[PDB]
Amino acid sequence: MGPGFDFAQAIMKKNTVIARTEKGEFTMLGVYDRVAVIPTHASVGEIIYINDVETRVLDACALRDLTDTNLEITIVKLDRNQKFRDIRHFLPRCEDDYNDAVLSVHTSKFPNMYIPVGQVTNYGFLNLGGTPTHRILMYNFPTRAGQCGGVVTTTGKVIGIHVGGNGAQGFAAMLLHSYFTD
Ligand SMILES: O=C(N[C@@H]1CCCNC1)c1ccccc1
Numbered sequence: 001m002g003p004g005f006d007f008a009q010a011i012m013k014k015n016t017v018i019a020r021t022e023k024g025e026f027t028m029l030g031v032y033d034r035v036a037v038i039p040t041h042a043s044v045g046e047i048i049y050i051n052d053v054e055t056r057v058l059d060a061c062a063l064r065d066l067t068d069t070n071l072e073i074t075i076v077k078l079d080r081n082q083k084f085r086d087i088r089h090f091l092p093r094c095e096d097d098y099n100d101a102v103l104s105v106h107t108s109k110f111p112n113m114y115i116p117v118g119q120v121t122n123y124g125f126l127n128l129g130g131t132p133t134h135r136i137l138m139y140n141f142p143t144r145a146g147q148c149g150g151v152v153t154t155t156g157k158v159i160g161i162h163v164g165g166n167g168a169q170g171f172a173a174m175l176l177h178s179y180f181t182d
Contacts, residue, residue: 005114008102008153014085016106016151020049025107026149028076029161030084031091031180034058039148039163039173040074041129048076055079063179069134072163072173075180090158091177097122098154101139103162103170105150113150117141117170120152120159126171128164135174136163143170 011029019028021042028050030036038044040062048055056079063071098120105113117139126136137152143165150162152172160172 003155004100004102004116004153007155008104008114008151011087011090011151011153011158012104012106012112015087017050018052018107019149020052021045025109025146027105027107027147027151027161028149029151029158029175032086032088033083034078034080035180036076036078036084037161037175038074038076039161040070040072041148041163042074044074044076048078050078050080065134067134070128070131071135072128072131072133073161073175073179087158088177088180090156091175091180092157092159093177095122095135095174095176096159098137098157098159100154101159102153103139103141103143103147103150103172104153105147105162107146109146115141115143117152120172123171126164128171133163133173135176137172137174139170139172140168141170142168
C-alpha cells in the first residue's frame, strides 16, 4: 500500500523460502549465498524441507550472546543449488528501536501476509516459553501461531525475525550485521 510494504514485498519475493521441520512450517529468511535464518525452536536437524524439497543441512548454529544467553536465532547453511540475493547491507549494525515496521509471513497457512505492526521497542530481556532470551524487539500486535520466522522490516532495513507473542504483543529476535560476517 506504501513504501514500507514495498520494501517488505521485495524481501519476501526474493529472500524467503518455506522451511518445514518436525516442529512445523516456518517463514525462513535467506541472507546471502546458501545461508538463512529460522527461530531456534524450529529444532533444525540434518535434513529440512525447503519449498517441499528434501534438503541436507550443511551446517547450523543456535546463536547465544556472550552472557551464554539464548538469542532464538539459528543460522542454517542449506545444500541448495541456488544462492540468495545478498541482503547483508540491509541489516542493522547495532541494537535499536524503530518506527513503522512491517511483519511479513509466507507459509501454506498464511501466504503473502503483511502486517503493519507500528512502533518497535528494543525490549531486551524476555522469558520466551520459559527460556531467558536477549535482544528481543516488541510490537503491539496480537500475533498468532504460524507467524514465527516472519520477517520484520522498516524501509531499507531487515531488523528481526518473529519468535513469539503473549496474545497482545509480538516479539522478534534482532538480526545484526555481525551475525553474518564470513
Ligand atoms: O558458524 C557456523 N557453524 C559453526 C560450525 C559448527 C556449527 N556451529 C558453529 C555457521 C555459519 C554459517 C552458516 C551455518 C553455520
